[PDB]
């Protein structure tokens, strides 16, 4: 609904006006009850992905984060993202971290967030998602799959059962689960991605997918962090294929603060998104499509704003793509140019479609 006015007016406008708490708040209510224009772009057959048992009418998802309670999917579609990941989900309600909790470094195109997990639980969640299933069915059908991502509750002894309580709950209602290892607002969390820790996790979450019934089996995948060592991401590429996961996503947010970031809010504590991320997790993409042969599908994601930037994921060995931050400073409009410059680029890059493109940097 034109980039240029949005990214230049009224965008700068919403900021100006409210914390980014409530910016967010506002967006998803917005995105909710259908108040966007419906987009304009038409998405070409070049876009189409096949990938973890389903079709994606076009690469580009809305990142886990956004609609956290799963309120706000079918506006979500409507905006033009080709599958919609919602969560993190907790299995009993829980507030998250005192605010403040989110900031904007403008400067950096940047934000840094410690949620800690505001969930309104499993059951809310599951109650939302069995309203529209039926509808969900035939969007996933027509191409537009959604993926529920799974955390564990705060003060849980067991984080293998938060976990497998999620696989019971919301596995039938999701095209795929992620399995989130790599929250940094969670204390102990990331170290869920150590060898043995993972293994055993996995184990459990995969025992309990493969006791859903057929139809209502979903793939699951884990998601990783940024800041991992070169240790770490063999021991996790070893994990998965030995466990057959289904795939992977790259990367959640960084506790790294990299050298040159200008906003005065840069020593918040959390994790940060955006920009400063986008090489980070592209270089993690293509080191973990390596280290698992090009045979485990990865969704890339961190930093995405534009169709190079979609691109150079995909090449790194991404199938798919998700943004988060670009939509809280581009605003819904983002969407559709991610789209068009992609579609642009394939074709000057002599790629019949996106799939000719997916891992291309390992082949050169
Ligand atoms: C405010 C905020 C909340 C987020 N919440 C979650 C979450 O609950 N679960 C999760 O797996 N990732 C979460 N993320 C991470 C995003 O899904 C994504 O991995 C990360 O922000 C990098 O993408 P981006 O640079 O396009 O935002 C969140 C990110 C932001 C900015
Ligand atoms: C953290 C977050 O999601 C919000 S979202 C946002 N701005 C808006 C504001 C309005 C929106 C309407 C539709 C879609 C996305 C929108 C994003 N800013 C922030 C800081
Ligand atoms: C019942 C447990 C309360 C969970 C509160 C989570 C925040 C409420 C709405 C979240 C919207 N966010 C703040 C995610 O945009
Ligand atoms: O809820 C959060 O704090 C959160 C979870 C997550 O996985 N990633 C993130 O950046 N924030």
Redesign the pocket.
Known sequence: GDERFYAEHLMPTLQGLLDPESAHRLAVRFTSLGLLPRARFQDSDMLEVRVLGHKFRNPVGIA??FDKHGEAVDGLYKMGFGFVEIG?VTPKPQE??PRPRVFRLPEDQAVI??????SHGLSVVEHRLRARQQKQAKLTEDGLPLGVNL?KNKTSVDAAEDYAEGVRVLGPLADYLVV?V?????AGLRSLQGKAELRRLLTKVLQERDGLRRVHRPAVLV?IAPDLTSQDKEDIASVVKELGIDGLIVT??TVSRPAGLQGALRSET??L?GKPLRDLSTQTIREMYALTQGRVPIIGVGGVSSGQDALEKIRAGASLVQLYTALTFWGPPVVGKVKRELEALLKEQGFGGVTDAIGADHRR
């Open positions: 886990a984060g993190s998250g971290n967030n410690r949620y800690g997990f505001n955390g989130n790599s929250s940094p607002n969670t998601k959640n947010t959390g994790g998104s």
